[PDB]
Structures are given as C-alpha cells and as structure tokens.
C-alpha cells in the first residue's frame, strides 16, 4: 500500500531529500516527546543500525524510513500532524514556566520543582524534578485503584466508605466502616484486601507490579530509612489499626499488623517528579498508561479514584480545592502534590514547606495559578473560554473561526444570527485574512435592511481602513447602487 | 453559482423537484430543533405567508425553498451538517424512551425533559405538568448573586463546602455552610439588591429566571406562597438565628429577606422550562436556545461546583460517586441535572425516598450515566461499554478552510505542510473563490507561493466575482519577484 | 400540765423577774431570726398589746408568757435552745462577712436564708433584679409536682448537653429543663386550659409561697424587651414547633410569651435567698412552714440544678463547689446547700462563661471553708468548719473519749486516734491527758504505748501543778515508776 | 465504782446471774459487728482463753466480763448504746432480703454486701464468689493519685468533667475527659510513682487497696491479666494515641502504663472486700472496720464527685437522677455503691444491660434508694414515704455531759442555762467522780456556783477519786468569796 510515510518525511524535510537524524530529533522534542520515549522504541533502533550499511553513513533517505517504521506510524503521524491533546506545546510550557517562576517569592527551601505528563505521552519538567521523595500517603488512590479493579466495585466498598468525613478524627461512618480510602483508616483497610492469600513480600511486589506500569517504568524505589521510621513512629496508625481491629471491620481471616506493615511499605515507595508526573497521567487517560500504551487499571477503577481525590484528596482543604481549582489532587507531608487534569494531563510538584492543612504552600499556589489561566476546572465551559486559554485546541483556531462564521451571512439575509455574536460580547472589530468585516462584506451589496442593524445596534466604527485602503463608499459606486450611500454619510 | 448552501433541498428532497411542507417539519423535527424555536420564527412566519398566497400552494421548488430556509442557514446547516453536540439525536432519544419504561417496574406522574447546549429538546412523560421549584432555585438564586456582586463578596456571608452530619449549624467562620441548604439560601436571597421593595425584588430574580429559562413557561403560585408562610416553621427558626449572630449584611430585614426566599421557592415551571435553565448552566451562562449572556462565567462555575458537592443533601456524596453529574432535587419529586458542555435535564416523579430525593428520578439518572459516558470523571476515548453520542467519531476539530487562509496570512508554511499530509483539497472556496495562494501573493511570501504552486498543483486561472486577477493585486504591492515566478507557469 | 414556758423566760431573763420586751428583741436577733418573722406573727400583736395595758409600761413577767405565747413555743424554744441547724450564727455570719469583703480585692451583695428560717444579708441585697433563667428550676419544680414525674419528662429530658446549644436528645426531646429549649417546653405544660394572664399568676402563686410572700415583682421593661430581642427563643420556639415536640393541642407563641413573663419577674437578694431555701428544704418554706412543692419535685430540681444549672462551670462547679446552683446574665447566682441553707448573690460583672465573677468566686471561698460540698464527709471535717454543730463540740467530745478510753485500758482505741492524725496532746477542761488517766489506774500496757508510739511530752502540768510521778506517791504503785523514769 | 460495763451484762443477760456463750454470739451478731472484726479480736481471744483454760468454761461472771471487755468497751458500748449510724440494723437488713428476693425474678450469680461507716457488715446471696475489678479500680486508682500527688498535678493530665461523647477524644486542652473512662484511667495509672519497676508499681497500688479494703480477701487473677493483654485491642488503640499527643508525663512509656492498668483491672475481690473499699470512700478516706487513714480528704471528695457524674458509663445521667448515689459498674456484672456518711455497698450479677450495667443489680439499687432516703437530694426530716434508718428522727446533737464540764470551765453560764431548760440533771459524772461544780469550783466563777447550787440543788460535798474536797482547792486558791457561799448550806 502507498503508505503516507513519505508524506511524513516531506513535512520533516523542508529542503533536499537527504536529512540528518539529528534534525529529526529536533522537531520531535518540539512536540514535547523525549528521544528516550518508550512509544517509539522500535523506531530509533533501526535508525542507529543504518550507520554502517548505508554508504553515506548517516544520511537517511525516503525509502529507508518506510521500512523501519511499522503499524505504529499512526502514533508517529499524530505527533507531527499536531493531533495530540496539547498542540503549541512550546508556548504552553513557557506559560507553565512563568507560573513556576512567579511563585518563587511565596515562602531545604531551594527544593522547588514541577513535572507534567500529557495523556498523549507529551511531557515537560522544570525545577528540581529528579530529587526522589516518598509517596507519603499519595499512594492511597493508587492502592485503592489497584484493589477496586482486581476485586470488584462492591467488594472494596463493603469495607470502606465512598464519601468524606468532614472533620485524624479516628471514627467510622454510619454503616460501620471507614469513611473513605483517602484517610488512614480507609487506606489501611483497602491495603488489607489486596492479595489476601499471599505473604508480605509477595503482596508488596504485586502492588508494586501495578506501579511501574502506572508510572511507565520510570524510577520507583522502596526506601528503607522511611520504612524503619514510621514503624517506630507509626503510633497514629497503630492506634487506627488496633481500633479497626477492635471494631472488627477487617475482612474475615486477615492479620492486622501484617496489613499495617504493607501499608508502611507503600508509603515508603520513593519516586521523582518526572516519574510522579507520568503517574496519574494514566489516571487522566482512564486506566491506560500514556507513555507506553499499557492498560493498567480498569475503567471503573480510574473513575472511582478520581471522584475520591475530588472529595477527600486534599484533607481539610479539599472543599476549597474542589471550588477554586476543581481538579483531583492528593497531597503529602513531604511537600509534594499529585494533580490530575482529566483528559488532558497529569502533574506532580515538589516544595518542602507545608501549610497548616497538610498541603504544600508553593504546590497549592501553583495549582491555583494554573487552573486560573488554562480552563482546566471541571465545570469551566469548554466553548466559552473567556480570558482562559484552552490548550486542547491550537492557538487562534477559535478566534479565527468565529470571524469566518460571522462574515458568512451576507446575501441570504441571516439578520438574527448577528445578534448572538454581538450579544455574547464577541469583538466585532476583528479583521479577517483579507481585512474584510461583516460591515464591509454586507456594505458591498448595499441592501440597507442588513447593515441597518450593525450601525444602529453595534455602533461599530465604519472608518476602518482595509488593506487596499478603499472605503465601502467606493465599493457601492463600483456596484451601481446609490440608495445605501445616503446612510453612509451619517454618523458624523 | 450552486454551492454547499443549496444541498439543504437535495438532502431533504432526495433530489425530488418538489416537496411537501410537512416533510421539512418532520425532517427538522429530527436533529432536535422544534418548530417554535426562538431562533426559527422567521422561517415559520415566512413559510406560511408566501405558501398560502403563492399560486404554487403546497409545493416547494428550489428557488422557493432556498428563500424560506434562508433566514436560519447557520442553524439549519449546523442541524443538517450534524454539527450539533449530539448528532445522533434521533437514536439518542430512542434510548431515553426504553430506559423511561424500564424505571416503571422499579419504585403515576413521571416525566423527563432534556435540552442540549445547542438547543436540541426532547421530552417524554408528563413533562408539561407545572410544579414548584421548591429547592431548585437555590443554585439559580446563588448564580444571580455571583454575577452582579462577585464570588468574594457573596461568600463573605456564606461558605462554599458541604455541611455533612441539621439546621442552625454554622462553619468555623461564623457563616452558613453553603448556599445549597435552607440556611444558606436565605442569606444569598437577602444579598440581592437590598435597596428596593420586596415585589420589585422578586421580579428582578424572576427576570433572570426567564432569561436563564429562555422565555418558556413560568408561574408564581400563590397557593404555595401563603401555604408555606403559614407553615415555614423550620425556615422561620433558621431566619431568627441568622439575625442573632449578625449573619445578614448591614441594613437587612430578616422578615423581608426571608419572604423573598419564599417567593422564589413558589415559582412554578415545567420540565421543559427547567431543562433550559439547566442547559443554561451547562452552556457556561448562555441560554442554549436564545443566545444571551444571562450569567457570568465565574457564576456558573461556582454554581456547578457546589451543585456537585452539596446538591442532593445526604445523598450528595453517593450521587457524586455513582453519577457524578451536578444535580438538585426537591420534595415535589423533580431532579434538576446539568451535564457540563453537553446538555441539561429535569425530571419529575412525586414519590420520594427516605433521604428526600425522588426515586424514579435518581433511578433514571443512575441508569442514564451508566450508559452514556456522562460521569464527570468517566473518560473520553476509552468509553468502555458506555455509548458516547457526543460525536459519531473522527474529530469535530478536523480540517477547515479557515486555518489555511489565516496560515497564509501569517506565513506559517509549516501548518500548510501539516495540512498537506491529510490529503487536503485546496479547491474548497469561500466568498473569495481563491485558495491560500492569493493571500501569500498579496503578502509576497516567496516560500509560500512556491510551495503551493508546485506541491499542490493549484489552478492559477481561478476566477473571482470581484474581478481582479491575482497578478493585478501583487502589482500594486510591488511584488516584482512574485510576478516572475507566477508568470513562469505559462 | 406544767408546761415549760416559764423555763424559756428564765434563760431569756438572767436577772430580775420582770424583763422589758426590748430585751426580748435582742437575743432573738442574735439567733438570726428577724422580728418580722411570719412564724411569730401572733406573738408580735400580743406582745405590743400588753406593753401599754400593763401598769409597768413594757415589763414582761412569767405569768404573761403562758397566755400570749402559743403553739409557736416549740419553735420559740428551738431558737434559744440552739436546736436550729446553724448555732453560733453571730460567728458564722462574721465569716460570711469575711468572705464577702475579701473577694472585693459597684453593685455587690449576698443574702442567705437557713432551712430553719434563720437568715442574714450583707451588701446591696435590697436592689431588685430580674430572675433571668433562675426561674427554670422553679417552673420545672412547679410543673413536676402538679403533673407527675413521668408526664413532664415525656417532653423534656433529664440529661446535660455538654456543648446556642441548639439540638435535641436521642429520644426527640430537649436535653433538660435548664436550657432554653427545655425551659420553654416545661412552661407549656402548666395549666393547659388557661390564658396568658391566668397561667402567669398561677405560676406566680407558687413563687410567692416559694419565697414566703416576700417581694415578687413582675417588671414590664424587661417583658417588652426580650420579645423584640427574643430571636434566640423565637428560633428555639419555632424549632420546637417544627420538631413537633410540644404537647397535643398547645399553642407555641403563647407558651413562649408566658416564658418571657417569668424571666422578667423581679426579686431582691433577700427575697431570692428565702427562695432556694424552700427547695433546700423538701418543698416546705422555712419562713412560713407551708408545703410549697412536692417531695419528688425538689429532688428532681436539685439533681438537674447540679448537673446543668451553671452553664460552662457546670462540670467544674460540681467538682470544686459541688452545690446545686443556677446563674443569670443579670450577674446573680442562686445557691442551695441542701439541709443547711438557701442563698443568693449579686454582682453585675459577668465572666466569659455566662456566670458572675464575684458570685462564683464567693461560692468557691464559701464551700472551701464550711464543709458544704456534697461529698465532703460530715464526721471528718479536716480543716473545714461545720456550722451544723456548734464550736468546740466535736473537739471537746474527742478529748473525753480519748481520756475515757484510757480509763478503760482501751489500748486498741488509742491506736485509732493517733493513726488518724489526731493530736494526742489535747488538754481537757482540767488539763488531764490519757497518760494521766492511765497513770491513775496503773494500766502498764497503756502507758507504754503512749510513750513509744505517741511520743507524748511528759512536761504537761495540770491546774494543781501535779506531775504523773507525783500521783504515784498518792497511790504507792512501784512498777510504772521505773517505766516513767525512762524516756529522759 | 459502778463502771458502765456492768450494764452491758445486765442488758444481754436480762439480769440473769449467768450467761451462756451462744447467747452472746447472736447478741453481738445483732448491731452488725462480726466476730472476726479486727477491733474485737482482743475480746474474742480473751473470751476463748478463759473458756478453754478454766473450770467455769463457757460462762461469764460480772468481774470476768468487765476485765475481758475492758480493752474494747468504747466500740462495744457504741454497738450496745445503738450509737451506730444504723441502730436498727437487725430490721434494716430485714428489708434488704425481701427486696433481694423481689429483684430475683428478672433476666445465676446474684449477691449483695454492705458495710456501714461504723463497721456494720451484712451480706446475702453469692457474695463470697470472687470476681475481677474490671472497671471498679478506676476510682480507687484515681484516689491514690490525688493523695500523694495532689488535685492540681493529677488533673493537668486529665480533665475533671464528664464527656458524653468508646470515643477516643480529648475535652478541650489535649488531655482525656475524666479519670473514669478507659482513656483517663490509663493516664492516672501512669502518674503513680514513675520511678520504679512495673512489679513494685502494682504492689504499691495493691497495698493501698488492701488498706482501703481493710485486709479482707484479694486476688491477682493472671488468667485475666494475660487474656486482656492478648485481647485489649481498645486499650492498645487508646494507649498509642496518648503518646502521639504527648498526653503522658515526661519520662513515661505507654508499654508500662497498659501493663499496670491491666494488672489493676485484674485484681480480684468479693462483695465483702469491695464493699469496705466503698465504705472507705463513705468515711472520707478512713477504713470503717479498721480505722486507718488510707486516703486524704480531698482525694475521696474528688473521687465521689467524679463517680457521681461519670461512674456509670452512659446510664450515669439517668442514674444520678433516679438514684443519685455515686456508683461504678463493670462488665463482670458488679456495681459498686457509695452512700456518703452512711455506708458502702457492692453488688454482683453477671447479665448486663445495653449500656454495660447489670440488669438485676441496677434494679436493686433503684429499689433501694426509693425506700431508704439515701438519694443525694432526698431531704432529712421530711422523709415523705421513705424509711430513714440513719437516726429514726432523733437529734444527733443531743445533750451530753461533756458540754457541761467545758461550759463550766469557760464560765459560759448561758450554755448552762440552755441545758437547764431541758430539765436535765447536772449530777451526770465522768470517771473522775466530778460534776460541773468541781470544774467551776476550781476556776472560782462566782456566778456559776450560785447558779449550780440553787438552780439544781446539787450536793457540794460529794466525794472524789482525787481525794480533795473542792472547798480545799478554793482555800488553796484563796477564793474567800466562794467559801462563805458554800458554807451557807450548812
């Protein structure tokens, strides 16, 4: 079949047929795809092989490119066709950069970093993003997602609730189970449901097996210093664990200290921001890892977890986060916040300083400045973006589209449609590709019934100069009609 | 001369030379839009006037058909291009009737209505029966307050988080928990323009509700206005407590403010009018069917966030999990529901459950979101077993002629190269009857014109109604270099 | 029938056989009874009649007593016989005066009425003040007696709240009559078929007998107020209306209105002190002896007044003071010392917990010095004084048993005194000790224990100058002399 | 001289010259005191010593009776003068057995024991069966802490007021609610001498409980000490939380604390031994039957105030109202009762109520207080329908010979005049063969002598043991005025 691989090369090769692979590496990082991306592992392999077989020793041509690429071409076109979920990435990251650099004033204070992974695998990172940190209680949804997928939607919720507590605060819901999996009592109970017929060592690696697919096989360590600690200092969880033992809310035939010990292992799992960003991007992508395409979690599992981060993710501040930011998140005592922008991207941030409610100061400030500028809120309308940008669509696409539809209804007499653009505060002064406007477009025919609304209602300035410098008065003379001309002399 | 405008006759007529009028109404009935649509009255009036007077009588020819449908081509092409949010409306509602009969088995007055953000309406069951907005005006009242006053001012007198486990409870700030309970509904109702009498105050809010509703039916039932003022024991109890704590603003009478909340609760609507108000919240503060900016952007966002969390009283938490759509219920048996960026809905079933929410309504909503991929945190792309009627497929952001002409204006050849990969045809013409070539020729971009003539094999002999050859336009701009290259083609 | 009336005159008249009645007034105020006492009403009319008729012009002899004095003799002897519940009253009030003046370091007063009718007042006790929420126990007592214990508590609880405070108990009724919700409900249980004017006087009828017909005013300025400002109670009343916790066929606005009348009832400290002495007694007023309240009405009111009476000191007051009390925003506290006395205090300055500063400080200093706490042991008073018994009563009694046990050779009993921290160096009327008693009888085992265990000082000198060694010469016993010679 | 001990023979013997021993056993059994009473052992030994080593055997003559009882007359006379707090003991317990049978029809271990503050003991039912003080040691532990440490120190680490909210929490200051719930019981156990090992810690408290009990039976059941350490999930949950919040003092570990608290909870007593510990709280920190100052005055006051409100778990509010006595219950089925200044009591019945109190034991307490005036706010004098065996009406402050002698010493004639009003004879005498006149004669008060000689006609020449006529003392003191007045009689 005459596959479009040659067409891909033509877009890449603006000039001669012989292009270096070094030039192919750039314009692939422009789309925010790293050279080391797993999704294109089978592509870069043959590119390095050709250094010896080819006489030119590096200068790729059109024919050789087709053979190396394969059924994965569909993903390869999408990157250069700008059909990912965030085109104009170079500008998008630049705005993520200015937000990041702005909050430096807001007070290891030097530790300050944020990373992000788009649902299409596109990614960017700024600041100290490669300093590992523990997922201190950030693994509660990860554990809950693993349990709910493998066991069933009802089984996991016979033993823990699905709605917040409203007040730490060791207590149970009305039914006799912990309020939600986002608190210690629920996180401990759900942790005890995973692989109940296995030992401590085997259970931990099975859960950790689900990680590194959630994380796309970036770094995932199991630190011991945090594991030895928090077992001597885990009095809060010992109190919860014994309380949960007393209230008999564990499953039948389950050890309690063993369940606690596994829970302490998970909290000690150490990740960087880059690996953290790729994590929860699989949550955005509905249980399928973006950076590799592996189906990690079930469809319901990623639905249930995201609703719970919205409710209980940020502890006491969850109510305000659900209002000012309206994104699922999960915070840690380490000073790092997990963030999910469903259908768009996943993001993780790091700043050690922490505010009174268990959340980072810079981290929460960053999430606020972000949603305020990029239409990310859950109930922000996608069509009427207002001053907020929509990275889901390439820049100026909506701005140019509105003009073309506005100018379209010249001669058929669609008077009514003009009202909605005007009454929606849409600017009538926008100039199209040829410097035309609905006033210029309609003023050519000289039928007063249409242009009458524009002057009377919109009060639009008719003194604008087109690219040719001609005024509609000359156009009317060019079309042999004088009646409309009388109205034109008015307004001054 | 003939172009995409004309196909409206061909697609409806199947090429038939003359069509009956009832075909157009039946065809237009599909795709959702109703004959009485505020944006289609021109066609209805223009249809009856000429047809009954013209000698042609009950037959529509091409010239006759074009002018009658000429008034609303932007909507009619949108409806017939299937550019609406739900282009499978004939079958999307076909699902809704089977679910409607399904909830009958579980448990006389049962009706549901819907209205998409593009104005597509459907209704089944007793949807015309009026009923009182007992509690559904709480978001609507709160939305009005945000727009004129603001979120910072409105929330000094009320919180923004669920209360949980129940009156006479306040947050740590000394204000009611949120505007979605009786306590918070009173305080926001008091905030609305405390400088005019009660009667004018009611009509101000009633004016918004009609604009939010888009001028469909509304009522002000006095048989519930008085029957509550003589029975609102809990409301009176709440009101007295608020003024003790100085919760109301300065210079506000509790009895007047507490009477206004009673006036609004007594407003009467149907499923049809209510669904449009819901669809006004889905559409970001613009009526789907009349296109006015009734509300501010920040108002509807705050309204939906609180409707999601605090909407359904005690069942709010479970509803945000199984269904995840902002909603609001009332003792009358009606559930308001908002699907952001998609549609709005309203149900009605007088029987209720122990938690104060309608059983058929909540049964219907659960059976809906489980099938149509509408949950807030359900994902696009990976629909799983759920149907996704928001798009037949491909992309709603596919190739268009607009990006070319502005790409030519800006000199972004790379975008043109990206468009070239999609086997895009350059022959699609707007008013210009010109491809991207002229704009680059006018600008003088040397690389763009060379790319277009060679890479795409564009016709240089394209005519235009304005009567100027592309070479002539370049002459005024002194693009001498462009002249030589273009002339070399022949 | 040789009645003991003439014996009363002899103790009253230490001198000649004809005494002026002016001297009878004094020594009747020393016992803390006022000349205006209702119990001796008939006496006052009779005494003044013969002051003018008698040729002596006031002098009173024995023969008059047997005729004019009457059934009130049994009470009249009780005052001079010191058989009331608080003898040595002149010293007792001096300490209450001491506490009063001490807490000072402009309106400040306290009054007290003993359960036997005895009474004292100091400060600004005569300035009237409203009875704001101090009527809550009084209305509950009136309601609980007339209706029944089961009826009144179908509609209000008997439990505290420990938390304004708008909520109901688990059963669906307000927690207790000591809160506004419970206080308003009990108000609605009184005289179902009567009107606002008739109900209020029937309740006020009880209050007048409660106070022994002392001043009972119904101010209007506070009644007009608290109906405009009663939003808290309107909120409660409508709340109680909504919850349907009122009795069948009862209007809510009227029940609220009656409640506002009671709070506006105005009393002085003197009148308020006689109040809380009726229910210090078992529903019998001391100053009149009339049965005001039922037996199982003062038991319930005091139990609830202890639990819930004070507002936020309730837990601490039941610990540091342990007395039923009720406080008001006016700055006045009602006190009950069951079986002892009633009491009321006044100081406007009110602390952050809704209770008076000087008032609560006074109750602290009082109970700390006078054995009034509920679980203070009566027999082992420690450093706390006991007004129930006259001074030097137990102290002298312990000496006699300590010295008498020595005579019997009761060595075992002597262990209890010493090991109970009691001072064994106590001197009797004639300066003897147990060592002296044992020395006389020659109980060798007794004297040995005192020297070894008690370490008694042998330097004690009797009034005659005799030393225990000298008594040996009187009776000529040798064996104990050798033991006595030791220890020095 | 005629010592009062002879009257004890006459009243027991009814004037009979010779008494059998078995008569005395029943006679002393009445008035409450048991043969094994620590304060009556000397009489019992001397009673048995002569009987088994004399020809007379089991018979007591007057001289034999006087010398044997001489060591214990002050308590034996108290028992036979009916000076005990319950002089009607033979019938007071006769009531207790009928109530005992009446409650013994509800739904078997059922036993009750009592001990008065004067050491009168009675028991009925299975009172000898031991059981563990599961929760009843909470007041006892708290009392020990107050005495050595103080109320200010002990309550820095625990509040002093109930909770009403089983519920791991803290009142308002980062400390447990009260020492009567499991959370507060643990903190006080940690406060007791945190400078020595666990085992010595247990025996220090056990030493107090022996003295509070007065040396009756106690046990240390290890089958409950271990069975709670391997099952005390609630206690471990509470303990872990306390150290997180730094509620324990400095230099304390939760490991030791729960070990001690389970040791104390596992101490074993019977109804008899427990009742005396209760009666030790009645008598203000002194054992009734042995007279040791085990506790401080402020310790038992604080203990009883907290036992009143917090003693029962959730039935306490309804218990402080219907019964009003300080009490304490345990899962074993035993209720500890303290009737201040009267007696202590302990019950035992395994089956419980919904709130963890014994059904057959709690009904008995209500049926008791309803009949015997013991409610904290029942009134003396006006007993209503309730029996009052405390003093059956009489004045405890009745006239005595002691007041005359000390009144004579101080010269307060008015007190003597008050005594004279009662027609009482001033010839009542102490051991020393001296009436009030001798004391007055020694002092030389002129007015007192005139009152005594005439108001009562008392002999002034009565002989005395000390062997000197009072006139001779006056002659020694040169009270010439007294001489002539005294001589005027002859």
Numbering used by the authors:
A (entry chain B): 69 to 175, 190 to 249, 252 to 576
B (entry chain C), D (entry chain D): 69 to 175, 192 to 249, 252 to 576
C (entry chain A): 69 to 173, 192 to 249, 252 to 576
What does the paper say about this structure?
Several high-resolution X-ray structures for KGA and GAC have been reported; however, thus far, there has not been a structural determination for the full-length apo-GLS2 protein. Therefore, we obtained a cryo-EM structure for wild-type, full-length GLS2. Figure 1a, b show the 3.1 Å structure of the human apo-GLS2 tetramer and the relative positions of the key regions for catalytic activity (i.e., the ‘activation loop’, the catalytic site, and the ‘lid loop’ that opens and closes over the catalytic domain). The stretch of residues Gly248-Glu258, which has been shown to play an essential role in catalysis and thus referred to as the ‘activation loop'23,34, is disordered and flexible in the GLS2 structure. In addition, residues Tyr182-Lys188 in GLS2, which correspond to a loop in KGA and GAC forming a ‘lid’ that needs to close over bound substrates for catalysis to occur, are also flexible like the activation loops in the GLS2 structure. The C-terminal region of GLS2 contains an ankyrin repeat motif consisting of three pairs of helical bundles located on the distal ends of the tetramer, which is absent in GAC. Each GLS2 dimer within a tetrameric unit shares an ankyrin repeat bundle connected to the catalytic domain through a flexible linker. Interestingly, the ankyrin repeats asymmetrically occupy the area between the N-terminus of adjacent monomeric units within a dimer, showing a preferential association for one monomer over the other. However, within the GLS2 structure, the ankyrin repeats appear to hinder this movement and thereby may prevent the activation loops from adopting the positions necessary for maximal catalytic capability.
The glutaminase enzymes GAC and GLS2 catalyze the hydrolysis of glutamine to glutamate, satisfying the ‘glutamine addiction’ of cancer cells. All glutaminase enzymes share a catalytic domain containing identical active site residues and a conserved mechanism for hydrolyzing glutamine to glutamate. Here we demonstrate that the ability of GAC and GLS2 to form filaments is directly coupled to their catalytic activity and present their cryo-EM structures which provide a view of the conformational states essential for catalysis. Filament formation guides an ‘activation loop’ to assume a specific conformation that works together with a ‘lid’ to close over the active site and position glutamine for nucleophilic attack by an essential serine.
